[PDB]
Amino acid sequence: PTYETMFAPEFGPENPFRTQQMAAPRNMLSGYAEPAHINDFMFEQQRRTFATYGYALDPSLDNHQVSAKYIGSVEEAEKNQGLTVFETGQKKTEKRKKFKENDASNIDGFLGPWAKYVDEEEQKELDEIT
């Protein structure tokens, strides 16, 4: 196999008779679906990074042929300067103090991890809808 064979472009006016979606490559009726063998842990880490903080690195192979950015909402990534969820962060801010009873001696007073937190007109419309 040679690079010049597969990298050779296609002659033509690109056939703009079709729509954008039907001219686009596929194997499955919705996009070219193909297997993969990513590391489990870094998949889960950057997944949880996006799921919490709304940014992650982008997965690709041949989008621009160079892709090294972040995605989602961009500016909050550099607000935290690219930290993760498994890191003891630079500050301990907006924490929320629970009250603990971990003796197992008092009864109806022991709340271990089950501790409920220290924090603890529409019905006219609801009756007229029902």
Binding site: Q81, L83, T84, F86, E87
Partner: peptide
């Protein structure tokens, strides 16, 4: 460039302490 020169070491020897840590080579 300034503190990233050791913050990248923090992230790398943070991440690699879970990349291969828990004997990936709990079951029963």
């Amino acid at each position: 460039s300034e503190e990233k020169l050791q913050e990248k070491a923090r992230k790398w020897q943070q991440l690699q302490a879970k990349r291969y840590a828990e004997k990936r080579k709990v079951d029963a």
